[PDB]
Amino acid sequence: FTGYQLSATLKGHDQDVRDVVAVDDSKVASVSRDGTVRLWSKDDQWLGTVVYTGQGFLNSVCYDSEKELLLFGGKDTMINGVPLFATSGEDPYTLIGHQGNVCSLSFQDGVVISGSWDKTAKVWKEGSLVYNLQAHNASVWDAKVVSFSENKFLTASADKTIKLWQNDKVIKTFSGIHNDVVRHLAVVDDGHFISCSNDGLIKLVDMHTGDVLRTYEGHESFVYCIKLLPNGDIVSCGEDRTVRIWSKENGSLKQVITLPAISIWSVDCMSNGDIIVGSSDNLVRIFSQEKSRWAS
Template identity: 35%
Template sequence: MANTSYRLRCQLYGHETDVRSVSTITEYDGIVSGSRDKTARIWRPSDKTSFEQRVVLKDHTNFVIATCYIPPSNKFGDGLIVTGGNDKKICVYSAKQGTHLFTLEGHEQTVSCLSYVPQSDLLLSGSWDQTGRVWSLSSKRCIQTLSGHSKAVWTIISMGDVTNNSNIILTGAADNIIIGWKNYTKFQIYEGHTNCVRSLAALNSNEFLSCSNDFTIKRWNINSVQCLQTYEGHTSFVYSISIISSEQFASVSEDRSLRLWSINTSESKQTIRLPSGTVWSVCSLTNNDIVVGCSDGRIFIFTKDASRTATMEEISAYEQEIASTTIQTKTGDLGEVKIDDLPNEDALKKPGTREGQTTMINKGNGHVEAYQWNMLDQRWMKIGDVVGSADSTAQGQASATGEKILFEGQYYDYVFNVELDENVPLKLPYNITDDPWYAAQEFIHRHELSQMFLDQIAQFIITNTKGMVIDQRASDFFDPFTGQVIY
């Protein structure tokens, strides 16, 4: 059987924490990555399978959230790398040398997304200040501000080049809508998502994809307000999408998976589990290899080409790492679990029916394991040990067997997901023996938040743990900043 599935190519190490953005350097199939370690990095292929880190870009003073590569032009013959961050700045670099050329300033909050209009000198940016901006790279100034969203803008794209729909820009935001702009004027609103719109990708000059915190991906035509198609399969926030070809695209999610989709079918063709807690970003190289950035600082690259695939030893080690992870049922990895209703391991003797199919096996004594069907190898692959159950439903609880939750090498009674107004889930670990204000202060320091949140976070901890014991958790978990139930 021909290999039509993606396999691990390599892993890249260098970032110290979350890789929030990855972009393709199309000239040589390189990668630019941005991280919460306040750096962006340029990676270049070093041999048939791996990459080497060439340059570390250190001009931001806070998290790097967005990256963009712009091919060479008459004005910028070396091409450009552009980065945006929590310091509200946009830094522009020579793609060839990695030298800082200039900084664009004007956004009043975090710069959350970047893209460009092909065959022009126009850069597009979006921000938590609820606006999109259009910049002239030649004049180094903002030439237009797109104001229309009521919450943070998370994604912005151009629908074409200078000869085809170059005057159409799309923005997606935390107000759940997508706005179409023609000649910088609002001409269309696309409604259908029920939560924050995280990423947009143009399929062609007339159609585009969107993904959302509502766990779905949608397909649209710019000339119609009606959604053409909905892709379902992810079990948590979908953070990023990337077009691989005219027939295929990729998506990544809080559910720790990379999924491959056919444009014309609504079910994913392949599901690849990652050992990292969150998969933030995805891009595709010109050779159709797929790059993803993860919350543990690693970058993973997957390929269909057998000549670029990792060794069997490397793949085995990767699968073993996935098998040894724990899956929290209420963080959206697999959905709810009712242990008594699960089959025993005899169920693994029966082949799966589709690529990426998951099942949970009751191993006895409250021990549950998760498996995923690998259609290529015709086998069930263990993807982790499941903790949590449908009978104890608060976010971040201990398991049904009294196990604590492992977070960054330590065990906690709770690991809450806290969303700020910008819809970025942050982990808040807590033990019932801790002081709420001390835990809140640690959380603020960890994520470089304003001190004004101290009382709110401490009260949040108290409200969601008051009177609880480990196996009894309230189902009315709420977030102090948004008032939402998370997951």
């Protein structure tokens, strides 16, 4: 390992950046409480364009790589989609059904899965609601596909539990992982996931036994987002102004990146290993291990 260093600072949003996504190694997208979706493209420098504007806060984004749509949602309860060539002012693709803030979005293998403060996650295919995952007693902060072919899904909630679903039924509840709001999930494989929480912890969990296999300790506040890098390492971020990189296999805290923002809301990983970061200073940042891409 060698440390990540700042590659680019992407300025344009006027309020917090709440979610970021890699589109490809030359394109990233972000959404913000400013109500915009921005697509940033790298030529020599990164240039941002607004591909959608609305009044409602946007809190989640993902990328449907076959339709080449940026999907996004937030306070107005809708999930919309725009192409990579949309212009601000054009009406958006719409997934209707949530009754509260859409706080998470993910896409895998043709499946969109959304988490909401309406206390549900919803699973969508071909523009249509297939499963309503209704069971949690409080906001669903995250939802992920475990297996598209088995219709297995994983949700994380303010009710302090993680639930594994098959179809629209809960088949297992993990109530012993965190004693606080669960904020995010990353599926390692069919048999393991990582979760993070307002308790400041990230944990690797055996999906079959519910055993905590490893705890990654160090964040000093809430942990809002976790992702797996191409090499399997964990990237996390949160309320303590940090982005952190961990060895999934042995728990080592490989790097702490401290930023001048009160909250770091979101991270995502490019295929080339670069890390995209959305924060409360209204910036998107890209970090890289590759010196050829360092801002310095």
